[PDB]
């Protein structure tokens, strides 16, 4: 069933919104709902996304 992926937690009912970046796939650390809420609750946390390339995977969390 599950693997090594990491789904949302604020909802635990959703994986994590995703977007497409030129040949690459962009995932988010929080779903669209919790994402907006993250702005509320999170304000400045859990803010992170993962980009997948047609060859390698990447992470872009703590950017500051």
**CA separation for the pair 51, 19 (Å, rounded):** 9
Is residue 49 near ligand ATP by the rule CB under 6 A?
Answer: yes
Nearer to ligand ATP, 10 or 56 (CB): 10
**Residue spans of alpha helices (H) in 3-64:** 32-37
Binding mask 1-40 for ligand ATP (x = CB under 6 A): ----------------x-x------x-xxx----x-----
The sheet carrying 18-21 orders its strands as 18-21, 24-28, 49-52, 57-60
Q: Which does 14 bind (CB under 5 to 8 A by kind): Zn ion, ligand ATP, none?
A: Zn ion
CB atoms within 10 A of CB 11: 14
Q: Among residue numbers 18 through 37, which ones bind Zn ion (CB under 5 A)? A: 31, 34
């Amino acid at each position: 069933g599950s693997f090594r992926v990491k789904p949302c937690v604020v909802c635990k009912v959703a994986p994590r919104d995703w977007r497409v970046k030129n040949r690459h796939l962009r995932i988010y650390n929080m779903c669209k709902t919790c994402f907006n809420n993250s702005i509320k609750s999170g304000d400045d946390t859990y803010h992170g996304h993962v980009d997948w390339l047609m060859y390698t995977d990447a992470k872009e969390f703590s950017s500051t």
